[PDB]
Write an enzyme that holds these catalytic residues in place. Structure first.
Site, short mmCIF file in Angstrom:
data_model
loop_
_atom_site.label_atom_id
_atom_site.label_comp_id
_atom_site.label_asym_id
_atom_site.label_seq_id
_atom_site.Cartn_x
_atom_site.Cartn_y
_atom_site.Cartn_z
N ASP A 197 -14.45 -7.58 -0.03
CA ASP A 197 -13.72 -6.65 -0.88
C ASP A 197 -14.62 -6.12 -1.99
O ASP A 197 -14.72 -4.91 -2.20
CB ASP A 197 -12.49 -7.33 -1.48
CG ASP A 197 -11.38 -7.54 -0.46
OD1 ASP A 197 -11.51 -7.05 0.69
OD2 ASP A 197 -10.37 -8.18 -0.81
N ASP B 239 0.84 -1.19 0.00
CA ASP B 239 0.00 0.00 0.00
C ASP B 239 0.88 1.25 0.00
O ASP B 239 1.77 1.39 0.84
CB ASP B 239 -0.92 -0.01 1.21
CG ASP B 239 -1.75 1.26 1.33
OD1 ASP B 239 -2.63 1.47 0.47
OD2 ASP B 239 -1.51 2.04 2.27
N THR C 42 -3.10 8.80 -3.02
CA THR C 42 -1.85 9.38 -2.54
C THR C 42 -0.66 8.91 -3.37
O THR C 42 0.29 9.67 -3.56
CB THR C 42 -1.64 9.03 -1.07
OG1 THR C 42 -2.83 9.32 -0.33
CG2 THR C 42 -0.48 9.83 -0.49
N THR C 43 -0.70 7.67 -3.85
CA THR C 43 0.42 7.14 -4.61
C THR C 43 0.55 7.84 -5.96
O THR C 43 1.66 8.18 -6.39
CB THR C 43 0.26 5.63 -4.81
OG1 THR C 43 -0.16 5.04 -3.57
CG2 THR C 43 1.58 5.01 -5.24
#
Lengths: 523, 529, 512
Positions: free
Chosen positions: B390, B53, B86-87
């Site tokens: 998920d 992550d 954010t990545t």
């Protein structure tokens, strides 16, 4: 200080110890030889900026020219290079097959020796697989030449050999060389590359080339004679210039009138020298070096055809066909050593007059391809394609058997040999299986030079062959890594090219594996 | 100049901050997407936190550099504001700096670059807003099933995804509730997923109500209730005590007798007060006395003992029962009539393998349901619970957001053509900056392609071709909104595949990444003390 | 500082491969020894794979992961740990397809995860069930550990101890058939006797010492009491100590200390018990009432240790002593004995019941021989645990490896794609197990391993493995080298899962 070098007692040569794997080092010298030519394999082969020993720049992709200019000093590499030289005998193609295949056999042999398998057992597997490959290769013969002497047939099969030497221009060269080869095949059992000569002329481009019969020479006729049917051709190596007497012949001149008298005496002598040429029944003369101004008019006086051949190889080319040998003296009337020819005339082709030695009276089994190109380096690289192209059909005068190309046979022959090793018990299966993986290096070379993931080509080539779709090779394309049928596209290789290549490559690899230590000597 | 510190100026300070931000991006570049590779985190002690992550990496990533700390402070802004993207922010901002640094070498001032990137972000948000799709395609259309199906295909549940996908979409819409001016959101606490050994995976049934893993105990009570009153008492009817940490000191033997007799007696009022309220579907947290269970048999109440706290917490929110911790109102004792009673329609204890699960039906307002994963063994039921959980949030995130956008590099690929054409209209030392802003966005599909083990140069080129054809003319032969499928290694229309993302992510990530590169490009000097 | 790029994966491979090369020769009955130079110049000549890596210092974090995963194996299974690291190192040692071919790790990991599902299926095909009711078969199975040990003189004794002990703990009625050797099979040593005197106590043995002689020495019907609170004066909510300076206040605080400890003891003795077992300590004043009551004083007994007692004798746990009802009585217990057996007291509350727990009595002649018998018996209990949890054995001696490798190589023929190459490489990695067994014996590795693969092709794959002692080939039906299935499946998953882990690492980053 001890302990020094181990196993070093013969002239201090670099003897690799048991840990350093002396056999592994001779293999590395052969792998480096493959990388120098692995990239030049195929139609998309990469050119090599070769620097000649005369500090001349040449850009080419021919394997024989790379090795001839690359001074290979390692003996372990010389053996594979000697196989390439032996490959040139009995066939004029498949040179990089010897370098790429043998390099894979030795490279894969290290994986066996590292496990612990003896080198003597590795050799027995490659010898068994080579014998097995020769039994499977006839079964892969897809088509065979009809031998109809058809330019449509000869040009179609010749496209595969022309490509990978001069790509893109495979249409013109296939038609021209077909026109030159078809005109000699009627001479049954006598075809040779020595008959089909090549004459390069500076010109516009490759498209402006054509074929002409007889020994063509680019240098136009210096004399004023247009045509002459005289058989006696007098060849002289010494040029037409101021005579010198082999004896003392001391010439003293003091006054200005004496200078003019001796000058006139030389012209009267040269008029007698050219007179002697016509006296011996020879209206043709050849010269190596310069040609004098007064002697030029003497050639037109008796209507003697003046010929100029500055190149030495052009002179020796005539000495072995017509017989006229070059003498050291300037115009010695030696009628015995003259030549014989049926017709000699000048002809203008592509806006250039070229000397011709045509055989009208005789049957005639000699031709010449007159190439045009705006660069000498380009025509020379195209000349190498003519040799590899003409020699492809010198092999078809033998048993006419074609096999698919584009790496198609290399996967099927590998697939058939891998199955033989799986069912064959013992230790020979390890080297037999690696003999099949050595064939995979050739499709991997074509795929890498085309900008394609090689592993994806092998995966697809094996799937279509698993379904029985033989004759499937690598589709040469930058943006399409798929495959296509080599038969439908017309890509075909020669049987004897693969036969003698797999044979000589295995002997070169086995000969290197049998060696375990290089030792110096002295006479 | 003489000082008590150090100074360093020039263009190399921009390059030093560029290579620093570029380094931080490479730490979270290969870990982009769902197929991202894990990365070690060697702490000072020696622990090794392994994860892929990008947000978890940047929280723990410790690089003592100012430019890197700006991107770490930038990460907190994106996490709090949205909680995703954010990545891509750190990667987008790193390429804008590496490209801007090249322009600065071409005598392009950073102020002209800062102006170009600001206008490019404005037009990019405009082109994004003009090419959205509102939250729709819920029922009657297929803007979901393909979304949940592609999310659960990783596990063994992917044998028959259509059968399990319908159970997600039908339940995800079942848990809808406006509750604020037509907001409707969906709860993080979602449909309870139980399991059973139903001889195969196909036998799993979708229930329209909550399922509880308990039983009434004595068979004298009914198993088919219709009373709407649902009791919820946390005070145990068993032997009550002062406290586990307070033992009632007792000395006289006779005093111990009446304590036993009175405690057995006081429950007779507690049970009569509870039965008088009429609640049939009774639930007890702290257990129920054995004699008290017998009182529900004669009364016919469906009482259950030792009910889990959290499972009961959702039932009170379902029926609306006031959770009571003690009967005594500081002076006496009462059941708080019309306070702890819920509202329902029917409650039946169905027959399920190895555990009789009670089913509650049509509560007051629950917005919840239950699914019983009937499978072969625990390994499949434990895996399908993770896959559905998920995939449940995959469809939840789409229907919660008001607008979405095609993901998988579709936005970054579309903006690569539009902003490149918009750059030719402005000029004035901003044509190159807007063009480099366009080229910088292609790193996202170029990075996602490398992580997916495919040729990034070809797939990035294929995206820009389908998106450029949409700009040349609006004809239907030209494909539109084409995304990037990571598994098959081929472009795919995300509208059919269901690869959607929120609009605020692509909007905020481009805005925050632009503000970060602007904050670093303005730095032309460093002063240390 | 940090690592990035292709240097990471190739570096993690060399680290994991290096750790496996250490213990390549530590496999089989003819395992080779290792010399560990201590910092003080000493040497330890151990040949245990777990002990070697435990004492070696490692700098790469990849090595710490390989070692830490091996320790997790030892807790679950005390056997086959050396096979995990060797297979994980061989699966990672194939760096040709990893970097030289420029394949992505996701392509490799997808093949390694595909083979793992095939390796698991093939092992179940070549498996064979076991009649656990017949202890004779379990003796031959448990002899894999007793062989080449000092306890071979009493080999049958170790089997009956470990076999019957695990059967008591095995609570099959709960469905999953869970077993807990750490809790419900607590082992305690007893000096005195010999190896033959080793047996299993059908109860719970507490190693509490005898503080006073006024305690029950021998009883036919014990009555055990249980409670968690301490028998001492009720202190405040905080840990504030009682500081007093006035003599008059002493008698007041003293009387409060005596009365509350007095009243609590009076309720404990109302049931007429034989021993008071408390979780917390017992002060001196509290013991004065136990010795006066002629009952044994016991303290410091953990929760699970007390839970087994209530199942053994029928006692009942209570919060405090004041709430002790008549139910808290150990009726039906066998006997209470605090005899000093071998210069050490031992509390025996054995009975004729199996309360899902037991205690092993390790008798011996000295502490050296006791510890030898101890560590040799734990592995036998684990083999009984692995067989009783899944009574299926697979052929050992490298047969299961070569049997599985033939299935993948034949199954890879229909594997169209680039994943066939690493899929086949995993099969060749399984051959390393017999490669080490043959290397240790000294026989030719290539000659036997070649013929070994040919036997699996023609003959049945369930047999024709390798003999580690002789070196020649032998059928596992003729040689009882049959190993459990749960040990091989977990050994195969942990090797692939570990190799998949280190392959997923591409950047060794520092930060907290």
């Amino acid at each position: 200080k001890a302990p020094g070098f181990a196993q070093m007692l013969k002239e201090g040569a670099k003897h690799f110890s048991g840990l350093e794997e002396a056999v592994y080092r001779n293999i590395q010298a052969c792998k480096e030889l493959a990388q120098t030519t692995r990239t030049a394999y195929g139609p998309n082969g990469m050119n090599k900026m070769v620097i000649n020993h005369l500090e001349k720049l040449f850009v080419t992709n021919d394997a024989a020219t790379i090795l001839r200019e690359l001074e290979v000093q390692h003996p372990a590499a010389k053996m594979i290079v000697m196989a390439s030289h032996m490959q040139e005998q009995e066939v004029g193609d498949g040179t990089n097959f010897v370098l790429v295949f043998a390099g894979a056999l030795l490279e894969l042999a290290e994986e066996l020796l590292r496990i612990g398998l003896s080198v003597s057992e590795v050799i027995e597997g490659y010898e068994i697989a080579c014998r097995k490959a020769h039994e499977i290769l006839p079964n892969l013969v897809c088509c065979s030449a009809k031998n109809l002497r058809d330019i449509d047939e000869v040009s179609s099969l010749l496209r595969t050999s022309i490509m990978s030497k001069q790509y893109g221009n495979e249409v013109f060269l296939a038609k021209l060389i077909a026109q030159a080869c078809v005109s000699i095949f009627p001479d049954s059992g006598h075809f040779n590359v020595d008959n089909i000569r090549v004459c390069k002329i500076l010109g516009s481009g490759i498209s402006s080339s054509s074929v002409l019969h007889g020994m063509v020479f680019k240098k136009e006729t210096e004399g004023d004679v247009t045509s002459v049917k005289d058989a006696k051709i007098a060849v002289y190596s010494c040029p037409f210039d101021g005579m010198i007497t082999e004896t003392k012949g001391t010439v003293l001149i003091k006054t200005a009138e004496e200078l003019m008298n001796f000058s006139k005496g030389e012209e009267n002598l040269m008029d007698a020298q050219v007179k002697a040429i016509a006296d011996t029944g020879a209206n043709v003369v050849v010269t190596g070096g310069k040609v004098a101004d007064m002697a030029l008019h003497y050639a037109n006086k008796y209507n003697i055809m003046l010929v100029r051949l500055n190149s030495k190889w052009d002179l020796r080319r005539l000495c072995k066909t017509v017989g006229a040998t070059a003498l050291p003296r300037l115009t010695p009337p030696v009628l015995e050593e003259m030549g014989h020819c049926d017709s000699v005339y000048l002809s203008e082709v592509g806006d250039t007059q070229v000397v011709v030695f045509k055989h009208e009276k005789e049957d005639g089994a000699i031709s010449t391809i007159v190439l045009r190109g705006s660069t000498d380096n380009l025509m020379d690289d195209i000349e190498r394609a003519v040799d590899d192209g003409v020699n492809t059909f010198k092999v078809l005068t033998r048993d006419k058997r074609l096999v698919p190309g584009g790496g198609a046979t290399e996967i099927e022959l590998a697939k058939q040999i891998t199955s033989y090793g799986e069912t064959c018990p013992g230790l020979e299966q390890y080297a037999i299986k690696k003999f099949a993986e050595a064939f995979e290096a050739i499709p991997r070379a074509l795929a890498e030079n085309s900008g394609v993931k090689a592993n994806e080509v092998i995966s697809k080539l094996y799937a279509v062959h698993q379904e029985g779709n033989k004759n499937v090779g690598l589709d040469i394309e930058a943006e399409v890594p798929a495959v296509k049928d080599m038969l439908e596209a017309g890509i075909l290789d020669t049987y004897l090219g693969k036969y003698w290549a797999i044979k000589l490559a295995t002997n070169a690899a086995v000969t290197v594996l049998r060696v375990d230590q290089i030792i110096m000597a002295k006479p | 100049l003489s000082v008590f510190g150090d100074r360093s100026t020039g263009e190399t300070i921009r390059s030093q901050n560029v290579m620093a931000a570029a380094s931080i991006a490479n730490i979270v570049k290969s870990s982009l997407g769902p197929v991202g590779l894990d990365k070690m985190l060697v702490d000072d002690i020696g622990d090794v936190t392994i994860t892929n992550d990008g947000a978890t990496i940047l929280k723990l990533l410790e690089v003592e550099h100012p430019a890197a700390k700006v991107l770490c402070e930038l990460a907190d802004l994106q996490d709090k504001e949205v909680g995703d993207g954010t990545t891509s922010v750190v990667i987008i901002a790193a390429e804008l700096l590496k490209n801007a640094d090249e322009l600065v070498k071409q005598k392009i001032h950073p102020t002209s670059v800062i102006s170009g990137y600001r206008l490019a972000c404005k037009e990019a948000v405009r082109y994004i807003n003009e090419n959205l799709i509102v939250n729709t395609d819920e029922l009657g259309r297929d803007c979901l099933i393909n979304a949940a199906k592609t999310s659960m295909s990783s596990k063994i549940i992917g044998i028959n995804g259509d059968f399990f996908a319908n159970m997600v979409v039908d339940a995800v819409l079942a848990i809808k509730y406006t509750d604020i001016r037509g907001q409707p959101r969906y709860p993080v606490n979602s449909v309870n997923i139980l399991k059973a050994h139903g001889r195969s995976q196909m036998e799993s049934m979708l229930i329209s109500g909550y399922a509880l893993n308990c039983v009434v105990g004595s068979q004298g009570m009914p198993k088919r209730i219709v009373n709407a009153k649902i009791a919820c008492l946390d005070f145990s009817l068993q032997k009550t005590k002062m406290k586990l940490g307070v033992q009632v000191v007792i000395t006289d033997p006779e005093k111990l007798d009446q304590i036993r007799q009175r405690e057995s007696d006081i429950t007779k009022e507690r049970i009569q007060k509870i039965l008088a309220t009429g609640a049939n579907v009774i639930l007890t947290t702290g257990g129920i006395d054995d004699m008290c269970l017998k009182y529900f048999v004669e009364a016919g109440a469906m009482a259950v003992r030792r009910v889990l706290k959290r499972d009961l917490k959702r039932i009170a929110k379902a029926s609306g029962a006031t959770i009571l911790s003690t009967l005594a109102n500081l002076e006496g004792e009462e059941t708080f009539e019309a306070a702890m009673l819920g509202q329902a329609e029917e409650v039946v204890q169905e027959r399920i393998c190895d555990d009789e699960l009670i089913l509650i039906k049509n509560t007051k307002a629950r917005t919840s349901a239950s699914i019983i994963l009937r499978g072969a063994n625990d390994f499949m039921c434990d895996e399908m619970e993770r896959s559905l959980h998920d995939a449940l949030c995959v469809v939840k995130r789409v229907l919660e957001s008001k607008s979405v956008v095609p993901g998988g590099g579709a936005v970054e690929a579309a903006l690569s053509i539009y902003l490149e054409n918009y750059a030719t209209s402005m000029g004035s030392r901003e044509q190159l900056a807007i063009a480099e802003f366009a080229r910088s966005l292609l790193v996202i599909p170029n990075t996602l392609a490398v992580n997916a083990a495919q040729d990034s140069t070809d797939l990035v080129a294929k995206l820009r071709a389908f998106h450029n054809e949409a700009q040349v003319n609006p004809e239907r032969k030209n494909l539109k909104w084409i995304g990037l499928d990571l598994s098959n290694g081929k472009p795919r229309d995300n509208k059919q595949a269901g690869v959607f993302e929120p609009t605020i992510v692509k909007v905020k990530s481009l805005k925050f990444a632009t503000e970060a590169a602007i904050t670093i490009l303005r730095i032309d000097d460093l002063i240390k003390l | 500082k940090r690592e990035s790029g292709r240097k990471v994966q190739s570096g993690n491979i060399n680290a994991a491969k290096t750790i496996a090369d250490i213990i390549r020769t530590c496999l089989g009955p003819k395992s080779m020894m290792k010399m560990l130079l201590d910092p003080m110049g000493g040497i330890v000549m151990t040949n245990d794979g777990n002990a070697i890596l435990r004492e070696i210092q490692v700098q790469h974090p990849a090595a710490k992961s390989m070692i830490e995963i091996s320790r997790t194996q030892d807790e679950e299974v005390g056997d086959g740990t050396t096979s995990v690291i060797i297979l994980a190192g061989e699966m990672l040692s194939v760096a040709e397809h990893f970097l030289e071919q420029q394949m992505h790790p996701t392509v490799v990991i997808s093949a390694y995860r595909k083979a793992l599902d095939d390796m698991i299926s093939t092992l179940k095909k070549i498996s064979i069930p076991v009649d656990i009711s017949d202890s004779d078969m379990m003796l031959n199975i448990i002899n894999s550990s007793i062989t080449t040990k000092a306890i071979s003189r009493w080999s049958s004794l170790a089997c009956n101890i470990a076999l019957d002990a695990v059967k008591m703990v095995q609570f099959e009625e709960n469905g999953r058939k869970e077993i807990d050797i750490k809790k419900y099979a607590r082992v305690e040593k007893i000096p005195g006797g010999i190896i033959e005197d080793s047996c299993v106590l059908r109860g719970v043995m507490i190693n509490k010492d005898v503080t006073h002689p006024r305690m029950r020495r021998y009883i036919k019907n014990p009555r055990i009491v249980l409670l968690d609170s301490s028998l001492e004066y009720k202190k405040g909510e905080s840990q504030t100590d009682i500081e007093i300076t006035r003599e008059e206040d002493f008698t007041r605080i003293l009387q409060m200390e005596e009365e509350y400890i007095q009243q609590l003891c009076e309720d404990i003795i109302q049931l007429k018990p034989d021993v008071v077992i408390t979780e917390k300590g017992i002060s001196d004043l509290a013991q004065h009432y136990l010795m006066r009551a002629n009952i044994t004083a016991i303290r410091r007994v953990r929760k699970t240790d007390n839970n087994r007692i209530a199942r053994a004798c029928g006692a009942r746990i209570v919060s405090r002593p004041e709430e002790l009802r008549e139910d808290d009585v150990g009726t039906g217990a066998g006997l209470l004995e605090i005899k000093k057996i071998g210069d050490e007291y031992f509390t025996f509350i054995t009975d004729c019941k199996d309360p899902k727990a037991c205690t092993i009595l390790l008798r011996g002649a000295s502490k050296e021989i006791l510890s030898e018998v101890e560590r040799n018996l734990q592995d036998a209990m684990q083999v009984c645990r692995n067989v009783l949890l899944d009574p299926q054995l697979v052929p050992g001696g490298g047969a299961s490896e070569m049997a599985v490798a033939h299935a993948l190589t034949e199954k890879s023929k229909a594997m169209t794609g680039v994943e066939q190459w690493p899929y086949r490489a995993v099969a060749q990695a399984l051959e390393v197990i017999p490669r080490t067994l043959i290397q240790n014996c000294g026989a030719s590795t290539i000659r036997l391993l070649t013929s070994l693969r040919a036997k699996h092709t023609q003959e049945n794959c369930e047999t024709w493995g390798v003999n580690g002692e002789t070196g020649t080939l032998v059928d596992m039906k003729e040689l009882g080298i049959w190993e459990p299935l749960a040990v091989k499946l977990q050994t195969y998953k942990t090797a692939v899962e570990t190799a998949v882990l280190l392959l997923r690492i591409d950047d060794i980053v520092s930060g907290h």
